[PDB]
Structure 1
Amino acid sequence: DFSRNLYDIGEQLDSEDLASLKFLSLDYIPQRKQEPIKDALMLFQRLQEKRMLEESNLSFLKELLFRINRLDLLITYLNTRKEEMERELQTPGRAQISAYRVMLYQISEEVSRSELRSFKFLLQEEISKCKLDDDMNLLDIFIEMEKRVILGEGKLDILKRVCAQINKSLLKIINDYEE
């Protein structure tokens, strides 16, 4: 009955919902595994194991479902309305998923696919201090690599490492040169 509900709910969660649910559960169900959670039932299995989900304790599951906007599943399988959840989670200290975690999730949802790619380039730059964007051509990069003294006549290692990962013909261009 509770078991039936968990399966019926699990059946309606797609791979996108699962990813979000796993992320929002990170402060409880640790990133670290080589036993990756591959569907919603496996996620529910671990929540039960951590004693955060059971017949008489649905509060974490309801909060998860609310935060990923599955209001359909909340009312259909848990007889729970939007406003019940709002009132619950507006009471200070009652939310189990931190506003921090929810905030990153909402960012994830707002980001376009081109914006995501910009995020990647912008992020790497913060760490590496090399400016890269979708519009740069390869020659300008070479010129930059040469100012970084990571590219040069006798410094083809990084170049070869990158090119070997990309295309056979490329690394052959390099190797043909080297003698």
Structure 2
Amino acid sequence: DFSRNLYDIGEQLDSEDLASLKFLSLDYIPQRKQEPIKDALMLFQRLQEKRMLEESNLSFLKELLFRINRLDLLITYLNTRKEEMERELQTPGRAQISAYRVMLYQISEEVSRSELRSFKGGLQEEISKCKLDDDMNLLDIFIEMEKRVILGEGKLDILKRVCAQINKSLLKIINDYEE
């Protein structure tokens, strides 16, 4: 049962997983349709409307779950191992989440709370006309930066400047992406 399996997968994803999944889908689901998505099922329904998810096409859902490190869900509900995922996503042209989006997600995955406060302060420095919200996570900050075109595939100067002021492993994730 396809719909039931989607429902069960959705029952195992909380608000934080959902925020991550929404960020990783940003290039296919725009902000107006992102806003009312409060549970994973609504995200899945939007993906079904684009035919990016159907009984015969599980690739994007598998890639999403892999990128947020839900290997438990991959094996339990989609009969898929980490190694199959790795070899599939290393085949050129098969990954549907861009390397840039994944890179940003991995940065946000290694920034702690205090490091988030340093990030927010440095970016408020770059944004001297708008007081940022205080509840923002790093993914929200990335979205705000993209809106101002101070962050993008061809613009990592401010990201690098801020990350270098915080931790060298962040600059490493960035440089590996560039390579």
TM more than 0.5: yes
Change (3 A) 1:144 1:56: closer
Change (3 A) 1:41 1:128: same
Taking the aligned partners of 1:168 and 1:59, their CA distance within structure 2 comes to 34
Deviation, structure 1 residue 137 = 25
Change (3 A) 1:45 1:174: closer
The residue that corresponds to 2:12 in the other structure is 12
Mapped contact 2:63–2:85 kept (Cα < 8 A)? yes
In the alignment, which residue of structure 2 is the partner of 1:25?
A: 25
Shift, 1:127, TM fit: 3.0
Q: C-alpha displacement at 1:33, in angstroms? A: 3.6
How many aligned positions are there? 179
Alpha carbons 2:99, 2:177 under 8 Å: kept: no
Percent identity for Structure 1 against Structure 2? 99
Q: Which moved more, 1:83-92 or 1:26-35?
A: 26-35
Aligned to 1:169: 169
CA pair 127-60 structure 1, distance change in 2 beyond 3 A:
same
Q: Return 159-168 or 113-122, whichever deviates more.
A: 159-168
Distance 1:54 1:143 in 2: 28
| Structure with larger Rg | 1
Distance 2:59 2:114 in 1: 36
Farther-moved stretch of structure 1 (62-71 vs 27-36): 27-36
Asked if 1 retains the 8 angstrom alpha-carbon contact of 2:17 and 2:68, the reply is yes
Report deviation, 1:52: 0.4
CA distance in 2, matches of 1:37, 1:4: 19
4+ residue runs over 6 A deviation: 129-179
Q: What is the CA deviation profile of residues 65-111 of structure 1, one whole-angstrom value per residue up to 9, with x for unaligned ones? A: 00000000000000000000000000111100001001111111111
Q: TM-score by structure 1 length?
A: 0.70
CA contact (8 A) 1:24 1:105 kept: yes
Unmatched segments (≥5 aa) in structure 2: none
**Is 2:100–2:177's contact at 8 Å kept on the other side of the alignment?**
no
- State the 1:48 CA deviation: 0.2
For residues 111 and 90 of structure 1, the distance between their equivalents in structure 2, rounded to whole angstroms, comes to 26
Structure 1: unaligned runs, 5 residues or longer: none
* Preserved contact between residue 125 and residue 131 of structure 1 (Cα < 8 Å): no
CA spacing shift, 1:23–1:82, aligned 2, 3 Å: same
Cα deviation per residue 1:13-60 (whole Å; 9 max; x = unaligned)? 011100000000000011234851110000001000111000000000
Q: 1:4 to 1:148 in 2, by over 3 A?
A: closer
Please give the alpha-carbon distance, in whole angstroms, between the structure 2 residues aligned to 1:52 and 1:178: 28
Contact 1:15 1:39 in 2 (8 A): yes
Go from structure 1 to structure 2 and tell me whether the alpha carbon gap of 1:136 and 1:112 turns closer, same or farther (over 3 Å shift).
Answer: closer
Q: Alpha carbons of 1:121 and 1:30: their partners in 2 closer, same or farther (altered >3 Å)?
A: same
